[PDB]
Design an enzyme around this catalytic site. Structure first.
Site, PDB file in Angstrom:
ATOM      1  N   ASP A  59       0.783  -1.236   0.000  1.00  0.00           N
ATOM      2  CA  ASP A  59       0.000   0.000   0.000  1.00  0.00           C
ATOM      3  C   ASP A  59       0.801   1.265   0.000  1.00  0.00           C
ATOM      4  OD1 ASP A  59       0.985   0.085   2.451  1.00  0.00           O
ATOM      5  OD2 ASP A  59      -0.617  -0.307   3.706  1.00  0.00           O
ATOM      6  N   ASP A 138      25.969   8.902   7.705  1.00  0.00           N
ATOM      7  CA  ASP A 138      27.407   8.926   7.426  1.00  0.00           C
ATOM      8  C   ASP A 138      27.937   7.523   7.066  1.00  0.00           C
ATOM      9  OD1 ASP A 138      27.058   7.867  10.051  1.00  0.00           O
ATOM     10  OD2 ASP A 138      28.513   9.160  10.890  1.00  0.00           O
ATOM     11  N   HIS A 142      29.535   6.921   3.548  1.00  0.00           N
ATOM     12  CA  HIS A 142      30.910   6.382   3.636  1.00  0.00           C
ATOM     13  C   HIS A 142      30.991   5.199   2.645  1.00  0.00           C
ATOM     14  CE1 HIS A 142      34.476   4.585   5.812  1.00  0.00           C
ATOM     15  NE2 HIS A 142      34.026   3.502   5.149  1.00  0.00           N
ATOM     16  N   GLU A 143      30.068   4.242   2.797  1.00  0.00           N
ATOM     17  CA  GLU A 143      30.166   3.046   1.947  1.00  0.00           C
ATOM     18  C   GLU A 143      29.915   3.365   0.453  1.00  0.00           C
ATOM     19  OE1 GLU A 143      31.194   0.127   2.588  1.00  0.00           O
ATOM     20  OE2 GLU A 143      31.746   0.933   4.510  1.00  0.00           O
ATOM     21  N   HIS A 146      32.952   4.509  -1.293  1.00  0.00           N
ATOM     22  CA  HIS A 146      33.906   3.474  -1.804  1.00  0.00           C
ATOM     23  C   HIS A 146      33.652   3.152  -3.273  1.00  0.00           C
ATOM     24  CE1 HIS A 146      36.124   2.522   1.716  1.00  0.00           C
ATOM     25  NE2 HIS A 146      35.096   2.102   2.466  1.00  0.00           N
ATOM     26  N   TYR A 157      42.918  -1.789  -1.225  1.00  0.00           N
ATOM     27  CA  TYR A 157      42.419  -1.881   0.121  1.00  0.00           C
ATOM     28  C   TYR A 157      43.468  -2.456   1.063  1.00  0.00           C
ATOM     29  CZ  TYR A 157      38.739  -1.385   3.482  1.00  0.00           C
ATOM     30  OH  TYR A 157      38.004  -0.738   4.422  1.00  0.00           O
ATOM     31  N   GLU A 166      39.879   4.473   3.207  1.00  0.00           N
ATOM     32  CA  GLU A 166      38.944   4.630   4.322  1.00  0.00           C
ATOM     33  C   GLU A 166      38.707   6.094   4.748  1.00  0.00           C
ATOM     34  OE1 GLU A 166      36.805   2.629   5.891  1.00  0.00           O
ATOM     35  OE2 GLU A 166      37.307   1.438   4.504  1.00  0.00           O
ATOM     36  N   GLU A 177      26.663  14.137   5.641  1.00  0.00           N
ATOM     37  CA  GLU A 177      25.911  14.348   6.872  1.00  0.00           C
ATOM     38  C   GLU A 177      25.718  15.836   7.176  1.00  0.00           C
ATOM     39  OE1 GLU A 177      26.733  11.922  10.215  1.00  0.00           O
ATOM     40  OE2 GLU A 177      26.788  13.695  11.433  1.00  0.00           O
ATOM     41  N   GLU A 187      32.076  12.766  13.902  1.00  0.00           N
ATOM     42  CA  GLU A 187      32.257  11.421  14.486  1.00  0.00           C
ATOM     43  C   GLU A 187      31.740  10.412  13.465  1.00  0.00           C
ATOM     44  OE1 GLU A 187      32.836  10.773  18.194  1.00  0.00           O
ATOM     45  OE2 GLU A 187      33.913  12.538  17.320  1.00  0.00           O
ATOM     46  N   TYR A 193      25.425   3.210  16.341  1.00  0.00           N
ATOM     47  CA  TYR A 193      26.356   2.420  17.153  1.00  0.00           C
ATOM     48  C   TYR A 193      25.884   2.290  18.590  1.00  0.00           C
ATOM     49  CZ  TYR A 193      30.881   1.065  18.958  1.00  0.00           C
ATOM     50  OH  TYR A 193      31.911   0.378  19.548  1.00  0.00           O
ATOM     51  N   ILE A 197      24.482   3.317  24.920  1.00  0.00           N
ATOM     52  CA  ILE A 197      25.496   4.273  25.346  1.00  0.00           C
ATOM     53  C   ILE A 197      25.416   5.556  24.535  1.00  0.00           C
ATOM     54  CG2 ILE A 197      27.949   4.503  25.845  1.00  0.00           C
ATOM     55  CD1 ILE A 197      28.175   1.473  25.441  1.00  0.00           C
ATOM     56  N   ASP A 200      28.983   8.147  22.197  1.00  0.00           N
ATOM     57  CA  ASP A 200      30.181   7.567  21.580  1.00  0.00           C
ATOM     58  C   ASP A 200      29.972   7.366  20.074  1.00  0.00           C
ATOM     59  OD1 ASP A 200      28.335   5.704  21.716  1.00  0.00           O
ATOM     60  OD2 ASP A 200      29.450   3.989  22.283  1.00  0.00           O
ATOM     61  N   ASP A 226      43.907  -5.996  10.039  1.00  0.00           N
ATOM     62  CA  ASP A 226      43.023  -5.034   9.386  1.00  0.00           C
ATOM     63  C   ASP A 226      43.615  -4.624   8.063  1.00  0.00           C
ATOM     64  OD1 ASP A 226      40.889  -3.022   9.219  1.00  0.00           O
ATOM     65  OD2 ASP A 226      42.130  -1.581  10.245  1.00  0.00           O
ATOM     66  N   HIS A 231      41.577   0.550   8.823  1.00  0.00           N
ATOM     67  CA  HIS A 231      40.667   1.325   9.662  1.00  0.00           C
ATOM     68  C   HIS A 231      41.414   2.079  10.772  1.00  0.00           C
ATOM     69  CE1 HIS A 231      38.112  -1.765   7.819  1.00  0.00           C
ATOM     70  NE2 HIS A 231      37.247  -0.750   7.727  1.00  0.00           N
TER      71      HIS A 231
HETATM   72 CA    CA Z   1      25.919   4.820  21.227  1.00  0.00          CA
HETATM   73 CA    CA Z   2      28.543  11.456  12.087  1.00  0.00          CA
HETATM   74 CA    CA Z   3       2.976  -1.129   3.633  1.00  0.00          CA
HETATM   75 CA    CA Z   4      25.491  13.147  13.567  1.00  0.00          CA
HETATM   76 ZN    ZN Z   5      35.134   1.953   4.467  1.00  0.00          ZN
END
Ligand code: CA
Ligand code: CA
Ligand code: CA
Ligand code: CA
Ligand code: ZN
Length: 316
Positions: A59, A138, A142-143, A146, A157, A166, A177, A187, A193, A197, A200, A226, A231
């Site tokens: 719908d 972001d 970010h991705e 790439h 890479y 990166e 953003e 950040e 994330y 919390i 962070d 890595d 990273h």
């Molecule tokens: Ca958090």
């Molecule tokens: Ca950010």
């Molecule tokens: Ca729907």
């Molecule tokens: Ca933000």
């Molecule tokens: Zn990346």
């Protein structure tokens, strides 16, 4: 799918309501025909087979909690497309309006999102470390950056070229953003994330050492994890980018900021004109100094700030 363009409405991962470009043909599909060759969002239905089924809805209203990650993946791909088109004159990631495809609900409890070479893939997170990764604009930009890098410089890479790879995704992810002015900051991944919390994020560009990443070339990671620290060592370039934009004094070197817009124009030019698959940090500095020179003149403040910033993070 062949059908009629229309607009539906739904809620994203954070509960915010938005309009999205859909296509009608018996069902309403997450297919946006207004940008390039189309933006298409698929349901991977908790499996790892890609891309899954083009998202179909009876719908045109996407308020189910299963819908959320699809709504944001589809919407933030459009915003990233707009950014690159309006700000850099680039049409999609190849520069020729290639279709952008994303699958959400990939696997179960998957604490990641990635550009695989042909499309975007987003896990839903385990619900503790992350919530569905397409809720972070972001992360999405970010991705998707790439895919731009893959079609232009082609940075491999691993080791310093992967670290540059990166950092370039964190920079444009952050600039997107700010462009969408979605509570912007320096950040990465803070909207999705650790839902338990506050304050962070995965990484910080203004102070990479907050989470333990190097903020100076003498602190770089030199082992093999890595893929040689792609990273981890991107913190050095991220800190340089932050200082070019915002200014500051870093290990006693003072940098006058020239702002976000000039930062994006210098790095986009460096990326599409001067970086190669094996560039390393010193060649990034030379590319950024040549870009700023091209755009602003060799005796501009812009050039002088690009030099100070790289001197502040120890890159000669
Ligand atoms: Ca958090
Ligand atoms: Ca950010
Ligand atoms: Ca729907
Ligand atoms: Ca933000
Ligand atoms: Zn990346």
């Amino acid at each position: 799918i062949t059908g009629t363009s229309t607009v539906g409405v739904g809620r994203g991962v954070l509960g915010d309501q938005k309009n999205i470009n859909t296509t009608y043909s018996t069902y309403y599909y997450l297919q946006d025909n207004t940008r390039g060759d189309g933006i298409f969002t698929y349901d991977a239905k908790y499996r790892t087979t890609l891309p899954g089924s083009l998202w179909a809805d009876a719908d045109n209203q996407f308020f189910a909690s299963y819908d959320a990650p699809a709504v944001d993946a589809h919407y933030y791909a459009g915003v990233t497309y707009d950014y690159y088109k309006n700000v850099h004159n680039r049409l999609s990631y190849d520069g020729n309006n290639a279709a952008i495809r994303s699958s959400v609900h990939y696997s179960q409890g998957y604490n990641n999102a990635f550009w695989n070479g042909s499309e975007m893939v987003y896990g839903d997170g385990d619900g503790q470390t992350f919530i569905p990764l397409s809720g972070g604009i972001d992360v999405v930009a970010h991705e998707l950056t790439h895919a731009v890098t893959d079609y232009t410089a082609g940075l491999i890479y691993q080791n310093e070229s992967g670290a540059i790879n990166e950092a370039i995704s964190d920079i444009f992810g952050t600039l997107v953003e700010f462009y969408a002015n979605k509570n912007p900051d320096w950040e990465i991944g803070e909207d999705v994330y650790t839902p338990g919390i506050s304050g962070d994020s995965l990484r910080s560009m203004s102070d990479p050492a907050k989470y333990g990443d190097p903020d100076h070339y003498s602190k770089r990671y030199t082992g093999t994890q890595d893929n040689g620290g792609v990273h981890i060592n991107s913190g050095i370039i991220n800190k340089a980018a932050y200082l070019i934009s915002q200014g500051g004094t870093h290990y006693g070197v003072s940098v006058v900021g020239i702002g976000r817009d000039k930062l994006g124009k210098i790095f986009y030019r460096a990326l599409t004109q001067y970086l190669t698959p094996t560039s390393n940090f010193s060649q990034l500095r030379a590319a950024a100094v040549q870009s700023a020179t091209d755009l602003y003149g060799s005796t501009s403040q812009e050039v002088a700030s690009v030099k100070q910033a790289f001197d502040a993070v120890g890159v000669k």
